[PDB]
């Protein structure tokens, strides 16, 4: 699994593509917040990069 793997997931917007996130999060025993996840440049996370791309009126 990537960090830019689940940026990817999250920017395409089909939630059936994000599919055992937490399979794998509880396999490798960590969390979103944690700093292979975070973007490190700004602090910027997968959830501000899901809700920046909003297609219709939801995402």
Do not use: H, I, W
Request: glycine share 8%; hydrophobic share 30%.
């Amino acid at each position: 699994f990537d960090r830019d793997r689940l940026f990817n997931v999250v920017a395409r917007g089909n939630p059936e593509d994000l599919a055992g996130l937490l399979e794998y999060l509880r396999r490798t025993s960590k969390y979103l917040t944690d700093s292979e996840y975070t973007e490190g440049s700004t602090g910027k996370t997968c959830l501000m990069k899901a809700v920046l791309n909003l297609q219709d009126g939801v995402n």
